[PDB]
Symmetry: D2
Subunit: 115 residues, 4 copies
Protein backbone atom coordinates (compact mmCIF):
# COMPACT_ATOMS: atom_id res chain seq x y z
CA UNK A 1 0.00 0.00 0.00
CA UNK A 2 1.98 3.03 -1.15
CA UNK A 3 -0.71 5.63 -0.32
CA UNK A 4 -3.18 5.75 2.49
CA UNK A 5 -5.21 8.39 4.22
CA UNK A 6 -6.12 8.75 7.98
CA UNK A 7 -8.82 11.24 9.01
CA UNK A 8 -9.60 12.26 12.62
CA UNK A 9 -12.38 14.36 14.13
CA UNK A 10 -11.35 16.98 16.72
CA UNK A 11 -14.98 17.68 17.88
CA UNK A 12 -15.89 14.04 18.68
CA UNK A 13 -12.38 12.77 19.52
CA UNK A 14 -12.74 9.89 17.11
CA UNK A 15 -11.78 8.65 13.66
CA UNK A 16 -13.74 10.52 10.93
CA UNK A 17 -15.91 7.73 9.51
CA UNK A 18 -17.50 7.58 6.04
CA UNK A 19 -15.62 10.62 4.76
CA UNK A 20 -15.52 10.65 0.98
CA UNK A 21 -12.32 11.49 -0.78
CA UNK A 22 -11.04 11.80 -4.28
CA UNK A 23 -7.42 11.50 -5.43
CA UNK A 24 -6.33 13.14 -8.69
CA UNK A 25 -3.10 13.12 -10.69
CA UNK A 26 -1.98 16.22 -12.62
CA UNK A 27 -2.03 15.57 -16.39
CA UNK A 28 0.23 17.08 -19.17
CA UNK A 29 -2.39 19.81 -19.98
CA UNK A 30 -2.24 20.91 -16.25
CA UNK A 31 -5.75 19.48 -15.54
CA UNK A 32 -6.63 17.16 -12.60
CA UNK A 33 -7.39 13.62 -13.75
CA UNK A 34 -9.31 11.23 -11.42
CA UNK A 35 -6.95 8.61 -10.03
CA UNK A 36 -8.61 6.87 -7.03
CA UNK A 37 -11.37 7.42 -4.48
CA UNK A 38 -13.23 5.92 -1.56
CA UNK A 39 -14.76 6.52 1.87
CA UNK A 40 -12.96 6.22 5.20
CA UNK A 41 -13.56 3.10 7.34
CA UNK A 42 -14.65 2.89 11.01
CA UNK A 43 -10.94 3.49 11.88
CA UNK A 44 -10.91 6.68 9.69
CA UNK A 45 -8.63 4.97 7.17
CA UNK A 46 -8.75 4.51 3.45
CA UNK A 47 -6.53 1.70 2.16
CA UNK A 48 -6.20 0.17 -1.31
CA UNK A 49 -6.28 3.45 -3.28
CA UNK A 50 -3.48 2.37 -5.61
CA UNK A 51 -0.61 -0.06 -6.18
CA UNK A 52 3.14 0.38 -6.33
CA UNK A 53 3.07 -0.10 -10.15
CA UNK A 54 0.39 2.60 -10.69
CA UNK A 55 1.68 5.14 -8.16
CA UNK A 56 4.40 6.77 -10.25
CA UNK A 57 6.13 10.12 -9.63
CA UNK A 58 3.85 13.07 -10.32
CA UNK A 59 1.71 15.72 -8.61
CA UNK A 60 -1.30 14.35 -6.74
CA UNK A 61 -4.25 16.00 -5.03
CA UNK A 62 -6.29 14.41 -2.25
CA UNK A 63 -9.68 16.22 -1.92
CA UNK A 64 -11.38 15.28 1.41
CA UNK A 65 -15.20 16.05 1.39
CA UNK A 66 -15.26 17.67 4.84
CA UNK A 67 -18.37 19.78 4.15
CA UNK A 68 -20.61 16.73 3.69
CA UNK A 69 -19.07 15.11 6.82
CA UNK A 70 -19.94 18.15 9.03
CA UNK A 71 -23.36 18.61 7.45
CA UNK A 72 -24.22 14.92 8.25
CA UNK A 73 -23.35 15.65 11.92
CA UNK A 74 -25.52 18.83 11.83
CA UNK A 75 -22.58 21.21 12.29
CA UNK A 76 -22.00 24.31 10.13
CA UNK A 77 -18.53 24.03 8.50
CA UNK A 78 -16.29 26.66 6.92
CA UNK A 79 -14.47 24.77 4.14
CA UNK A 80 -15.92 23.23 0.99
CA UNK A 81 -13.29 20.49 1.31
CA UNK A 82 -9.73 19.97 2.48
CA UNK A 83 -7.13 19.64 -0.29
CA UNK A 84 -3.67 18.08 0.07
CA UNK A 85 -1.46 18.65 -3.03
CA UNK A 86 1.99 17.07 -3.21
CA UNK A 87 4.66 15.57 -5.47
CA UNK A 88 5.36 11.82 -5.08
CA UNK A 89 9.19 11.42 -5.42
CA UNK A 90 11.22 8.21 -5.85
CA UNK A 91 14.25 8.54 -3.66
CA UNK A 92 14.28 5.04 -2.27
CA UNK A 93 11.39 2.83 -1.04
CA UNK A 94 8.62 5.16 0.24
CA UNK A 95 5.11 4.64 1.68
CA UNK A 96 2.93 7.77 2.08
CA UNK A 97 0.36 8.33 4.78
CA UNK A 98 -1.65 11.57 4.50
CA UNK A 99 -3.26 12.38 7.82
CA UNK A 100 -5.87 15.06 8.47
CA UNK A 101 -7.43 16.35 11.69
CA UNK A 102 -10.74 18.11 11.20
CA UNK A 103 -12.65 20.83 13.04
CA UNK A 104 -15.63 22.79 11.63
CA UNK A 105 -13.54 25.95 10.96
CA UNK A 106 -10.06 24.45 10.81
CA UNK A 107 -8.07 21.53 9.52
CA UNK A 108 -4.54 20.28 9.91
CA UNK A 109 -2.72 17.84 7.66
CA UNK A 110 0.61 16.09 7.77
CA UNK A 111 2.51 13.54 5.77
CA UNK A 112 4.23 10.47 7.25
CA UNK A 113 6.66 9.17 4.58
CA UNK A 114 8.44 5.91 5.62
CA UNK A 115 10.52 3.00 4.22
Amino acid sequence: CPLMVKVLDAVRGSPAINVAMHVFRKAADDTWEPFASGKTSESGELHGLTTEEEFVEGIYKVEIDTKSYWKALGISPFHEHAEVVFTANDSGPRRYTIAALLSPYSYSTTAVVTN
Copy 2:
Protein backbone atom coordinates in the same frame (compact mmCIF):
# COMPACT_ATOMS: atom_id res chain seq x y z
CA CYS B 1 -10.87 44.93 4.80
CA PRO B 2 -13.13 41.93 4.34
CA LEU B 3 -10.49 39.30 3.54
CA MET B 4 -7.10 39.10 5.26
CA VAL B 5 -4.52 36.28 5.42
CA LYS B 6 -1.99 35.62 8.24
CA VAL B 7 0.81 33.06 7.76
CA LEU B 8 3.14 31.75 10.51
CA ASP B 9 6.25 29.61 10.38
CA ALA B 10 6.32 26.76 12.95
CA VAL B 11 10.05 25.96 12.40
CA ARG B 12 11.44 29.46 13.04
CA GLY B 13 8.67 30.76 15.33
CA SER B 14 8.08 33.81 13.23
CA PRO B 15 5.65 35.32 10.75
CA ALA B 16 6.10 33.70 7.28
CA ILE B 17 7.32 36.72 5.27
CA ASN B 18 7.12 37.16 1.46
CA VAL B 19 4.75 34.24 1.00
CA ALA B 20 2.94 34.56 -2.33
CA MET B 21 -0.73 33.67 -2.62
CA HIS B 22 -3.42 33.70 -5.26
CA VAL B 23 -7.18 33.98 -4.60
CA PHE B 24 -9.68 32.53 -7.09
CA ARG B 25 -13.46 32.69 -7.28
CA LYS B 26 -15.56 29.94 -8.89
CA ALA B 27 -17.40 31.27 -12.01
CA ALA B 28 -20.87 30.20 -13.30
CA ASP B 29 -19.12 27.73 -15.70
CA ASP B 30 -17.50 25.92 -12.63
CA THR B 31 -13.95 27.21 -13.49
CA TRP B 32 -11.61 29.05 -11.05
CA GLU B 33 -11.37 32.70 -12.12
CA PRO B 34 -8.48 34.86 -10.79
CA PHE B 35 -9.75 37.18 -8.04
CA ALA B 36 -6.80 38.72 -6.19
CA SER B 37 -3.15 38.03 -5.29
CA GLY B 38 -0.32 39.36 -3.16
CA LYS B 39 2.44 38.46 -0.75
CA THR B 40 2.74 38.55 3.01
CA SER B 41 4.46 41.46 4.76
CA GLU B 42 7.10 41.43 7.59
CA SER B 43 4.18 40.65 10.00
CA GLY B 44 3.13 37.61 7.83
CA GLU B 45 -0.07 39.46 6.84
CA LEU B 46 -1.65 40.21 3.53
CA HIS B 47 -4.20 43.05 3.54
CA GLY B 48 -6.04 44.91 0.77
CA LEU B 49 -6.82 41.88 -1.42
CA THR B 50 -10.39 43.14 -2.08
CA THR B 51 -13.18 45.54 -1.12
CA GLU B 52 -16.63 45.00 0.40
CA GLU B 53 -18.16 45.89 -3.06
CA GLU B 54 -16.08 43.42 -5.05
CA PHE B 55 -16.14 40.58 -2.51
CA VAL B 56 -19.57 39.21 -3.40
CA GLU B 57 -21.10 35.83 -2.52
CA GLY B 58 -19.19 32.96 -4.03
CA ILE B 59 -16.87 30.00 -3.58
CA TYR B 60 -13.33 31.25 -3.08
CA LYS B 61 -9.98 29.44 -3.10
CA VAL B 62 -6.88 30.88 -1.35
CA GLU B 63 -3.78 29.12 -2.74
CA ILE B 64 -0.73 29.82 -0.51
CA ASP B 65 2.55 29.13 -2.26
CA THR B 66 4.27 27.29 0.58
CA LYS B 67 6.66 25.25 -1.65
CA SER B 68 8.45 28.43 -2.85
CA TYR B 69 8.61 29.71 0.72
CA TRP B 70 10.34 26.58 2.06
CA LYS B 71 12.66 26.12 -0.92
CA ALA B 72 14.09 29.62 -0.30
CA LEU B 73 14.88 28.57 3.32
CA GLY B 74 16.75 25.42 2.10
CA ILE B 75 13.93 22.97 2.82
CA SER B 76 12.42 20.61 0.24
CA PRO B 77 8.84 20.47 1.58
CA PHE B 78 6.05 17.98 1.06
CA HIS B 79 3.16 20.11 -0.24
CA GLU B 80 2.93 22.08 -3.46
CA HIS B 81 0.77 24.69 -1.74
CA ALA B 82 -1.76 25.07 1.02
CA GLU B 83 -5.32 25.53 -0.25
CA VAL B 84 -8.22 27.04 1.58
CA VAL B 85 -11.62 26.65 -0.24
CA PHE B 86 -14.77 28.19 1.25
CA THR B 87 -18.12 29.78 0.53
CA ALA B 88 -18.11 33.48 1.46
CA ASN B 89 -20.86 36.03 2.12
CA ASP B 90 -23.76 33.64 1.59
CA SER B 91 -25.60 35.02 4.73
CA GLY B 92 -24.55 38.61 3.94
CA PRO B 93 -21.16 40.38 4.20
CA ARG B 94 -18.66 38.98 6.69
CA ARG B 95 -15.01 39.81 7.46
CA TYR B 96 -12.68 36.83 7.03
CA THR B 97 -9.24 36.19 8.43
CA ILE B 98 -7.63 33.05 6.97
CA ALA B 99 -4.69 31.91 9.10
CA ALA B 100 -2.12 29.25 8.19
CA LEU B 101 0.66 27.69 10.25
CA LEU B 102 3.39 26.05 8.19
CA SER B 103 5.89 23.24 8.67
CA PRO B 104 7.85 21.39 5.95
CA TYR B 105 5.57 18.29 6.01
CA SER B 106 2.44 19.78 7.58
CA TYR B 107 0.14 22.76 7.62
CA SER B 108 -2.84 23.90 9.62
CA THR B 109 -5.41 26.47 8.68
CA THR B 110 -8.28 28.17 10.47
CA ALA B 111 -10.71 30.91 9.78
CA VAL B 112 -11.94 33.77 11.99
CA VAL B 113 -15.28 35.05 10.62
CA THR B 114 -16.84 38.20 12.09
CA ASN B 115 -20.04 40.22 11.40
Copy 3:
Protein backbone atom coordinates in the same frame (compact mmCIF):
# COMPACT_ATOMS: atom_id res chain seq x y z
CA CYS C 1 4.38 44.22 25.78
CA PRO C 2 6.79 41.31 25.92
CA LEU C 3 4.29 38.47 26.44
CA MET C 4 0.91 38.29 24.69
CA VAL C 5 -1.52 35.36 24.23
CA LYS C 6 -4.02 34.88 21.35
CA VAL C 7 -6.68 32.14 21.56
CA LEU C 8 -8.96 31.01 18.67
CA ASP C 9 -11.95 28.71 18.57
CA ALA C 10 -11.88 26.14 15.72
CA VAL C 11 -15.56 25.10 16.17
CA ARG C 12 -17.13 28.58 15.90
CA GLY C 13 -14.43 30.25 13.76
CA SER C 14 -14.00 33.09 16.17
CA PRO C 15 -11.64 34.45 18.80
CA ALA C 16 -12.00 32.46 22.08
CA ILE C 17 -13.37 35.19 24.40
CA ASN C 18 -13.18 35.23 28.24
CA VAL C 19 -10.66 32.40 28.39
CA ALA C 20 -8.86 32.46 31.74
CA MET C 21 -5.16 31.74 31.95
CA HIS C 22 -2.46 31.63 34.58
CA VAL C 23 1.28 32.17 33.96
CA PHE C 24 3.86 30.60 36.29
CA ARG C 25 7.63 30.92 36.51
CA LYS C 26 9.87 28.13 37.83
CA ALA C 27 11.64 29.22 41.07
CA ALA C 28 15.17 28.20 42.26
CA ASP C 29 13.55 25.41 44.37
CA ASP C 30 12.03 23.85 41.13
CA THR C 31 8.41 24.85 42.11
CA TRP C 32 5.98 26.82 39.87
CA GLU C 33 5.55 30.32 41.32
CA PRO C 34 2.55 32.46 40.22
CA PHE C 35 3.69 35.12 37.73
CA ALA C 36 0.66 36.69 36.04
CA SER C 37 -2.95 35.91 35.06
CA GLY C 38 -5.85 37.31 33.08
CA LYS C 39 -8.57 36.53 30.58
CA THR C 40 -8.88 37.00 26.85
CA SER C 41 -10.75 39.99 25.41
CA GLU C 42 -13.39 40.11 22.58
CA SER C 43 -10.45 39.74 20.11
CA GLY C 44 -9.23 36.55 21.95
CA GLU C 45 -6.13 38.44 23.14
CA LEU C 46 -4.59 38.92 26.52
CA HIS C 47 -2.19 41.88 26.81
CA GLY C 48 -0.43 43.52 29.77
CA LEU C 49 0.51 40.33 31.63
CA THR C 50 4.01 41.69 32.43
CA THR C 51 6.68 44.32 31.73
CA GLU C 52 10.14 44.12 30.17
CA GLU C 53 11.63 44.72 33.71
CA GLU C 54 9.69 41.95 35.43
CA PHE C 55 9.88 39.40 32.60
CA VAL C 56 13.38 38.12 33.35
CA GLU C 57 15.08 34.93 32.13
CA GLY C 58 13.32 31.83 33.32
CA ILE C 59 11.16 28.82 32.56
CA TYR C 60 7.55 29.93 32.18
CA LYS C 61 4.31 27.96 32.00
CA VAL C 62 1.13 29.41 30.41
CA GLU C 63 -1.87 27.36 31.60
CA ILE C 64 -4.96 28.13 29.44
CA ASP C 65 -8.20 27.10 31.10
CA THR C 66 -9.82 25.48 28.08
CA LYS C 67 -12.10 23.10 30.07
CA SER C 68 -14.05 26.03 31.60
CA TYR C 69 -14.28 27.68 28.18
CA TRP C 70 -15.86 24.62 26.52
CA LYS C 71 -18.14 23.73 29.43
CA ALA C 72 -19.76 27.20 29.18
CA LEU C 73 -20.49 26.49 25.46
CA GLY C 74 -22.20 23.14 26.33
CA ILE C 75 -19.26 20.93 25.37
CA SER C 76 -17.63 18.39 27.70
CA PRO C 77 -14.04 18.58 26.35
CA PHE C 78 -11.13 16.20 26.62
CA HIS C 79 -8.35 18.32 28.15
CA GLU C 80 -8.21 19.95 31.55
CA HIS C 81 -6.19 22.84 30.12
CA ALA C 82 -3.69 23.63 27.43
CA GLU C 83 -0.16 24.14 28.74
CA VAL C 84 2.66 25.98 27.09
CA VAL C 85 6.08 25.57 28.87
CA PHE C 86 9.14 27.42 27.56
CA THR C 87 12.41 29.09 28.45
CA ALA C 88 12.21 32.86 27.91
CA ASN C 89 14.81 35.61 27.54
CA ASP C 90 17.84 33.33 27.82
CA SER C 91 19.59 35.12 24.84
CA GLY C 92 18.37 38.55 26.00
CA PRO C 93 14.89 40.16 25.92
CA ARG C 94 12.46 38.90 23.29
CA ARG C 95 8.77 39.62 22.61
CA TYR C 96 6.60 36.50 22.71
CA THR C 97 3.19 35.83 21.25
CA ILE C 98 1.74 32.48 22.36
CA ALA C 99 -1.14 31.42 20.11
CA ALA C 100 -3.56 28.55 20.73
CA LEU C 101 -6.27 27.08 18.51
CA LEU C 102 -8.90 25.10 20.38
CA SER C 103 -11.26 22.23 19.61
CA PRO C 104 -13.11 20.00 22.11
CA TYR C 105 -10.68 17.04 21.73
CA SER C 106 -7.63 18.85 20.33
CA TYR C 107 -5.49 21.93 20.62
CA SER C 108 -2.58 23.43 18.75
CA THR C 109 -0.14 26.01 19.97
CA THR C 110 2.63 28.04 18.37
CA ALA C 111 4.92 30.81 19.35
CA VAL C 112 6.00 33.94 17.46
CA VAL C 113 9.27 35.24 18.96
CA THR C 114 10.67 38.61 17.84
CA ASN C 115 13.76 40.70 18.74
Copy 4:
Protein backbone atom coordinates in the same frame (compact mmCIF):
# COMPACT_ATOMS: atom_id res chain seq x y z
CA CYS D 1 -4.16 -1.47 25.80
CA PRO D 2 -6.30 1.32 27.26
CA LEU D 3 -3.74 4.12 26.71
CA MET D 4 -1.29 4.67 23.94
CA VAL D 5 0.60 7.57 22.50
CA LYS D 6 1.47 8.37 18.80
CA VAL D 7 4.04 11.10 18.05
CA LEU D 8 4.76 12.53 14.57
CA ASP D 9 7.43 14.91 13.29
CA ALA D 10 6.25 17.73 10.98
CA VAL D 11 9.84 18.73 9.92
CA ARG D 12 10.94 15.25 8.75
CA GLY D 13 7.49 13.90 7.76
CA SER D 14 8.01 10.80 9.86
CA PRO D 15 7.13 9.16 13.16
CA ALA D 16 8.99 10.83 16.07
CA ILE D 17 11.30 8.02 17.20
CA ASN D 18 12.91 7.60 20.64
CA VAL D 19 10.88 10.38 22.23
CA ALA D 20 10.79 10.00 25.99
CA MET D 21 7.56 10.49 27.82
CA HIS D 22 6.27 10.37 31.32
CA VAL D 23 2.67 9.76 32.43
CA PHE D 24 1.51 11.00 35.84
CA ARG D 25 -1.71 10.60 37.82
CA LYS D 26 -2.99 13.42 40.07
CA ALA D 27 -2.89 12.38 43.74
CA ALA D 28 -5.22 13.47 46.66
CA ASP D 29 -2.74 16.23 47.76
CA ASP D 30 -2.95 17.71 44.16
CA THR D 31 0.63 16.54 43.31
CA TRP D 32 1.62 14.59 40.15
CA GLU D 33 2.56 11.00 40.92
CA PRO D 34 4.59 8.97 38.37
CA PHE D 35 2.36 6.38 36.70
CA ALA D 36 4.10 5.06 33.54
CA SER D 37 6.82 6.01 31.07
CA GLY D 38 8.75 4.92 28.01
CA LYS D 39 10.24 5.96 24.66
CA THR D 40 8.44 5.92 21.32
CA SER D 41 9.20 3.08 18.86
CA GLU D 42 10.29 3.31 15.19
CA SER D 43 6.56 3.81 14.39
CA GLY D 44 6.36 6.74 16.89
CA GLU D 45 4.18 4.66 19.22
CA LEU D 46 4.34 3.83 22.87
CA HIS D 47 2.26 0.79 23.85
CA GLY D 48 2.03 -1.11 27.14
CA LEU D 49 1.94 1.94 29.44
CA THR D 50 -0.79 0.48 31.64
CA THR D 51 -3.54 -2.15 31.94
CA GLU D 52 -7.30 -1.91 32.12
CA GLU D 53 -7.20 -2.78 35.87
CA GLU D 54 -4.66 -0.03 36.70
CA PHE D 55 -6.09 2.69 34.45
CA VAL D 56 -8.88 3.96 36.69
CA GLU D 57 -10.77 7.27 36.43
CA GLY D 58 -8.65 10.23 37.43
CA ILE D 59 -6.66 13.16 36.01
CA TYR D 60 -3.58 12.14 34.01
CA LYS D 61 -0.73 14.12 32.50
CA VAL D 62 1.39 12.93 29.57
CA GLU D 63 4.67 14.93 29.44
CA ILE D 64 6.42 14.44 26.03
CA ASP D 65 10.19 15.40 26.15
CA THR D 66 10.16 17.37 22.88
CA LYS D 67 13.16 19.56 23.80
CA SER D 68 15.55 16.59 23.94
CA TYR D 69 14.09 15.24 20.66
CA TRP D 70 14.80 18.52 18.78
CA LYS D 71 18.20 19.00 20.41
CA ALA D 72 19.23 15.46 19.23
CA LEU D 73 18.32 16.52 15.65
CA GLY D 74 20.33 19.79 16.09
CA ILE D 75 17.26 22.04 15.87
CA SER D 76 16.53 24.87 18.34
CA PRO D 77 13.09 24.24 19.92
CA PHE D 78 10.72 26.57 21.76
CA HIS D 79 9.01 24.31 24.33
CA GLU D 80 10.55 22.53 27.30
CA HIS D 81 8.06 19.70 26.69
CA ALA D 82 4.52 19.12 25.46
CA GLU D 83 1.96 18.37 28.17
CA VAL D 84 -1.42 16.68 27.64
CA VAL D 85 -3.65 16.82 30.78
CA PHE D 86 -7.01 15.05 30.78
CA THR D 87 -9.60 13.19 32.87
CA ALA D 88 -10.11 9.47 32.09
CA ASN D 89 -13.91 8.84 32.37
CA ASP D 90 -15.77 5.50 32.45
CA SER D 91 -18.83 5.90 30.30
CA GLY D 92 -18.68 2.57 28.55
CA PRO D 93 -15.69 0.65 27.10
CA ARG D 94 -13.03 3.25 26.09
CA ARG D 95 -9.51 3.06 24.61
CA TYR D 96 -7.50 6.32 24.54
CA THR D 97 -4.96 7.29 21.92
CA ILE D 98 -3.12 10.58 22.55
CA ALA D 99 -1.57 11.82 19.33
CA ALA D 100 0.90 14.68 18.97
CA LEU D 101 2.39 16.38 15.91
CA LEU D 102 5.60 18.25 16.59
CA SER D 103 7.37 21.24 15.06
CA PRO D 104 10.25 23.19 16.67
CA TYR D 105 8.00 26.15 17.67
CA SER D 106 4.60 24.47 17.64
CA TYR D 107 2.77 21.33 18.62
CA SER D 108 -0.70 19.95 18.09
CA THR D 109 -2.38 17.20 20.07
CA THR D 110 -5.62 15.30 19.76
CA ALA D 111 -7.38 12.46 21.48
CA VAL D 112 -8.95 9.48 19.68
CA VAL D 113 -11.30 7.78 22.19
CA THR D 114 -12.91 4.57 20.81
CA ASN D 115 -14.84 1.42 21.89
